[PDB]
Design a protein around this motif. Structure first.
Motif, mmCIF file in Angstrom:
data_model
loop_
_atom_site.group_PDB
_atom_site.id
_atom_site.type_symbol
_atom_site.label_atom_id
_atom_site.label_comp_id
_atom_site.label_asym_id
_atom_site.label_seq_id
_atom_site.Cartn_x
_atom_site.Cartn_y
_atom_site.Cartn_z
ATOM 1 N N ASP A 48 0.857 -1.178 0.000
ATOM 2 C CA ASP A 48 0.000 0.000 0.000
ATOM 3 C C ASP A 48 0.894 1.230 0.000
ATOM 4 O O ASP A 48 1.597 1.496 0.983
ATOM 5 N N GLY B 13 0.709 5.083 -0.087
ATOM 6 C CA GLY B 13 -0.102 6.263 0.077
ATOM 7 C C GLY B 13 0.716 7.536 -0.012
ATOM 8 O O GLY B 13 1.903 7.530 -0.343
ATOM 9 N N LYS C 68 3.069 0.971 3.487
ATOM 10 C CA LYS C 68 2.867 -0.257 4.239
ATOM 11 C C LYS C 68 3.052 -1.448 3.312
ATOM 12 O O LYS C 68 2.777 -1.366 2.114
ATOM 13 N N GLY D 125 -6.843 10.075 2.824
ATOM 14 C CA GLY D 125 -5.489 9.815 3.256
ATOM 15 C C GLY D 125 -4.733 11.085 3.565
ATOM 16 O O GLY D 125 -5.314 12.064 4.039
ATOM 17 N N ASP D 126 -3.428 11.077 3.313
ATOM 18 C CA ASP D 126 -2.620 12.272 3.492
ATOM 19 C C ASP D 126 -2.695 13.208 2.295
ATOM 20 O O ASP D 126 -2.322 14.379 2.417
ATOM 21 N N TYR E 4 -9.526 11.302 13.744
ATOM 22 C CA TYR E 4 -9.703 12.294 14.801
ATOM 23 C C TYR E 4 -10.842 11.888 15.732
ATOM 24 O O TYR E 4 -11.830 11.298 15.282
HETATM 25 N N1 LIG Z 1 -4.076 9.078 15.177
HETATM 26 C C1 LIG Z 1 -4.193 10.108 14.304
HETATM 27 N N2 LIG Z 1 -4.886 11.217 14.629
HETATM 28 C C2 LIG Z 1 -5.001 12.241 13.770
HETATM 29 N N3 LIG Z 1 -4.458 12.262 12.541
HETATM 30 C C3 LIG Z 1 -3.736 11.215 12.087
HETATM 31 C C4 LIG Z 1 -3.564 10.053 12.966
HETATM 32 N N4 LIG Z 1 -2.820 9.166 12.288
HETATM 33 C C5 LIG Z 1 -2.540 9.709 11.080
HETATM 34 N N5 LIG Z 1 -3.087 10.928 10.959
HETATM 35 C C6 LIG Z 1 -2.971 11.786 9.760
HETATM 36 O O1 LIG Z 1 -3.139 10.966 8.605
HETATM 37 C C7 LIG Z 1 -2.067 11.151 7.685
HETATM 38 C C8 LIG Z 1 -1.632 9.804 7.138
HETATM 39 O O2 LIG Z 1 -2.627 9.333 6.240
HETATM 40 P P1 LIG Z 1 -2.536 7.834 5.680
HETATM 41 O O3 LIG Z 1 -3.701 7.039 6.208
HETATM 42 O O4 LIG Z 1 -1.119 7.365 5.880
HETATM 43 O O5 LIG Z 1 -2.734 8.075 4.111
HETATM 44 P P2 LIG Z 1 -2.082 7.026 3.093
HETATM 45 O O6 LIG Z 1 -2.201 5.713 3.822
HETATM 46 O O7 LIG Z 1 -2.936 7.115 1.854
HETATM 47 O O8 LIG Z 1 -0.675 7.548 2.960
HETATM 48 C C9 LIG Z 1 -0.944 11.829 8.441
HETATM 49 O O9 LIG Z 1 -0.408 12.889 7.648
HETATM 50 C C10 LIG Z 1 -1.581 12.384 9.693
HETATM 51 O O10 LIG Z 1 -1.692 13.800 9.562
#
Ligand SMILES: Nc1ncnc2c1ncn2[C@@H]1O[C@H](COP(=O)(O)OP(=O)(O)O)[C@@H](O)[C@H]1O
Ligand SMILES: Nc1ncnc2c1ncn2[C@@H]1O[C@H](COP(=O)(O)OP(=O)(O)O)[C@@H](O)[C@H]1O
Lengths: 71, 374, 50, 117, 374, 50
Positions: free
Chosen positions: E10, E12, E17, E155-156, E305
């Protein structure tokens, strides 16, 4: 409505549409300038992705070996 | 001569046109949007304008949110329509509405509340002495110059076909389809993402509409055109954005108008325009089909793509029996046809008995438009 | 005084350049219209002969 | 010849002539005169003078400045008084008058003509 | 048995991952950051290293310029992505890439070239036997364990909602919004300056991201939360920087996630996430809206969140007609849900006929991915 | 030095002005050529229509 309403606002005298015979052969603005800078078609639906192929019916695809290992 | 000619107003979803009766051309043509500022403005002494209507809204698309009052032929919001009519009457024509009758057009199959509210607004607020409501495709047949034929009108909101034989319209064969230029614009915005270009907001939507107007055409043979476009780059055009960037569309040019003929691309199950016209023809009687085949008229701005007439003629000839004769008549001035015949309808001496007077409206409320019109 | 002269000369020159640019783009539009009308001419004449 | 533009322009010229003749007819009461309707309404003083003559009611002082925003102020004061006198105007802005939109200034003059007498 | 587990990767915007098919959890999780030095090296004798990848870049972020190869779901720097994939295969999993098939994910709407490049690099540089490219929301729906539902994944770098009814996806209702955690981090920087704290460089970007992860929540009611924060200092928290200084976040805890629901704070015209889901539901057919309301699935780390499900449910309940169930299904392990879907996708018996072989790639170029992948 | 600027800007202004003039003349002759082309198009159109 000083000088009359109809004189202040230049409402046209005559009907210009009445003069022409065939409105079909009319163009207002003359041309278009663009500068660079049998049988009918049958309707088609979008393809699926949940089955590999329909090339031969009554076929058990679970008997077939995987594609990548065919060498 | 009496003169005092009625104002002819064509109100569609895309653009609003207005002019005087008996003229060959409308006086004012302008897009029908209302814009409001969305950014916080900090310049004291700068003049404050609450809303922007018309062409000057289009000139300042950067700091505005553009809204269309008319969606699929139905007036969704009425205050914006009142503003548009006020700007049409007082700024674009410089006339007083109390001295003239007016003639409005609408789609065939609309909710009756739309027509009732239109009549009530035109009488109560603007104090017009008389007003009439007509159907756009009948006025298109007026502007064509013949009394027999089938009209396939296609604006920015709705595409409808009506047959008329010897001045008699058959209402059971009227067909209405909710596929128009706005759906094509949204589809173009969707399919432009594949090349990497992204357009989201309303100003970018207007830019995409400009791209559609400049560089689109209908392919005669869709599959061979796709094969030709995939084989080489002989069909590629470059457009220049307002910020100086240059984009290239190429393969997409004939894919946007093809959704008119194949609505399965947009997820609709409905048939294309050619099958709608064919079904509207065969919903009529037996003996009048031969005359309706030879007098198919196109209208509206959506039918302004290059090569659409040959594609429609080929599809209808494929659908129809072989021994008949198919003649698609398409004027080079179809884009204004809905207006033009309307002026002719206001030029007739008989039509002076067809106006809805102020006395009749006062006597019978706003429901007199159902008995009087069509 | 000569410093005052400079700026107005420069501003007039800039305006002249703007007029020249818009004239050029109108010129290219006219030329493209001309040759497009030419092959449209040819194809319509061919249909008439047929 | 873009027949829409031709019809609009030939209505436009005659309406501009008639409007500026009417404006000069009212503006000759004070020692004022305009020669072009488009350029003379940019400063916003002539509009204030004409509105004072027609209404017979005083107006706030125009700002004696030659800046662009001073022109915007002078136009906006007249438009503010027009809004105070129940006159309804869509998309009528000070910058539209200052840069000189033909249709909007003609519509403004027509609106005063139909509102007052 | 001659059955080899295919690697599920994966990729992102924020983190990468990776793991084996049929496993419960990914073996490797690490940020997708490539860093390079920005100072003079004077200690001659130490080893020289040109680029830092993953957690090694994060541990020594004080002397590096951190760059993300993927931004807004679109990969821009291809050599950095090659380094990320190569470090995943050889240092985090320690497997031969030419033995196992691989499975990759991407956003629904993206430039068409990426897939082709994602094929061309994977078959040629890594010599994998087969590969397949899936869409993250479908894999989220797999991980939820239900055939029907609507999946919103943020996602991010990207947010997207798809509806799926009984396994048939509706492509005309798929919505993509370019609002995600990166813009929330940037807005947190922009609003943290009010208290007097300055964060400029990329290491400060990582610090602000950690602050946002630890000390942010979504208010159920925005105005009442603002009034409570103004009334007293009960809603305040403290954070310790790696220097040892102490900052007090105060009011800014819930203003940053509120930009997910009112994108006017960031200067965007588009609507919030709840209106995006509602518009995606209303774009579907009439008979399937009731099942889509009952099966809303949240996904992605940005939906992590506290207080997000209650706010989403309240907003959609306000928008929807007051008759039907509004149930928001959010699994606790939602951040990894997409990857879990991949582990189920590569373990099915029918999926072994879905791999894109090297032979087909050699026969038809990199454009085979459009025909063989959704 | 500032006189030297005045000299160079005068050169630039004069050249730009007469280049603008020749562009305008080219524009005019192209436009009237387009008018001749459009009557030719119209007359062969009408013949084919009959
Ligand atoms: N426990 C959490 N609480 C709040 N925001 C989070 C948390 N974990 C990750 N994030 C936010 O999510 C983003 C990561 O997104 P992610 O799920 O990794 O997207 P992708 O998997 O598509 O890369 C990070 O930049 C962070 O800002
Ligand atoms: N030259 C053109 N080529 C192709 N399409 C056009 C062209 N001009 C306008 N259109 C399309 O036609 C639409 C305008 O239709 P119009 O006839 O004005 O609708 P109505 O008059 O019924 O409101 C626009 O939305 C645009 O997409």
């Amino acid at each position: 409505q000083v000088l009359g309403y109809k004189d202040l606002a230049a409402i046209p005298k005559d009907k210009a549409i009445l003069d022409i015979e065939r409105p079909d052969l009319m163009i207002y603005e003359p041309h278009f300038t663009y500068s660079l800078l049998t049988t009918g078609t049958p309707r088609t639906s979008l393809p699926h992705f949940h089955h590999p192929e329909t090339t031969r019916p009554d076929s058990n695809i679970y008997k077939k070996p995987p594609i990548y290992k065919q060498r | 001569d009496d003169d005092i000619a009625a104002l002819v107003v064509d109100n569609g979803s895309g653009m609003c046109k207005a002019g005087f009766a008996g003229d060959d051309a409308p006086r004012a043509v302008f897009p029908s949007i209302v814009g409001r500022p969305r950014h916080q403005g900090v310049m004291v002494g700068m003049g404050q304008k609450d809303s922007y209507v018309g062409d000057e809204a289009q000139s300042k698309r950067g700091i505005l949110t553009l809204k269309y009052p008319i969606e699929h032929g139905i007036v969704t919001n009425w205050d914006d329509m009142e503003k548009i009519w006020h700007h049409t009457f007082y700024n674009e024509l410089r006339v007083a509405p109390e001295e003239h009758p007016v003639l409005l057009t609408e789609a065939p199959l609309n909710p009756k509340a739309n027509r009732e509210k239109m009549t009530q607004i035109m009488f109560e607020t603007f104090n017009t002495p008389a007003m009439y409501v007509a159907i756009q495709a009948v006025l298109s047949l007026y502007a064509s110059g013949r009394t027999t034929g089938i009209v396939m009108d296609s604006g920015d909101g709705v595409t409808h076909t009506v047959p008329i034989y010897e001045g008699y319209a058959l209402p059971h064969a009227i067909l209405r389809l909710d596929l128009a230029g706005r759906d094509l614009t949204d589809y173009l915005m969707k399919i432009l993402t594949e090349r990497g270009y992204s357009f989201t907001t309303t100003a970018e939507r207007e830019i995409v509409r400009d791209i559609k107007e400049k560089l689109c055409y209908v392919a005669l043979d869709f599959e061979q055109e796709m094969a030709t476009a995939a084989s080489s780059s002989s069909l590629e055009k470059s457009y220049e954005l307002p910020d100086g960037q240059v984009i290239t569309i190429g393969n997409e040019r004939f894919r946007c108008p093809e959704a008119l003929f194949q609505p399965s691309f947009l997820g609709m199950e409905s048939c294309g325009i050619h099958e709608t016209t064919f079904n509207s023809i065969m919903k009529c009687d037996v003996d009048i089909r031969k005359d309706l085949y030879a007098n198919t008229v196109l209208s509206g701005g959506t039918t302004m793509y290059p090569g659409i007439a040959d594609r429609m003629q080929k599809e209808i000839t494929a659908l129809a029996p072989s021994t008949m004769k198919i003649k698609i008549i398409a004027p080079p001035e179809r884009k204004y046809s809905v207006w033009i015949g309307g002026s002719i309808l206001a030029s007739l001496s008989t039509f002076q008995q067809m106006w809805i007077s102020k006395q009749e409206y006062d006597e019978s409320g706003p429901s007199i438009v159902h008995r009087k019109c069509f | 005084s000569l410093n005052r002269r400079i700026q107005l000369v420069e501003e007039e020159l800039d305006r002249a350049q703007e007029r020249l640019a818009t004239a050029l783009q109108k010129l290219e539009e006219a030329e493209k219209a001309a040759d497009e009308s030419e092959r449209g001419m040819k194809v319509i004449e061919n249909r008439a002969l047929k | 010849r873009s027949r829409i533009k031709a019809l609009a322009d030939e209505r436009e010229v005659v309406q501009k002539k008639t409007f500026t003749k009417w404006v000069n007819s009212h503006l000759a009461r004070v020692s004022c005169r305009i020669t072009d309707l488009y350029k003379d309404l940019r400063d916003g003083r002539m509009l204030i003078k004409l509105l004072e003559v027609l209404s017979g009611e005083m107006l706030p002082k125009p700002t004696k400045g030659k800046m662009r925003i001073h022109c915007l102020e002078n136009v906006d004061k007249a438009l503010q008084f027009l809004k105070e006198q129940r006159v309804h105007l869509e998309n009528m802005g000070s910058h539209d008058i200052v840069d000189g939109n033909h249709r909007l200034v003609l519509g403004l003059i027509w609106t005063i003509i139909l509102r007052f007498q």
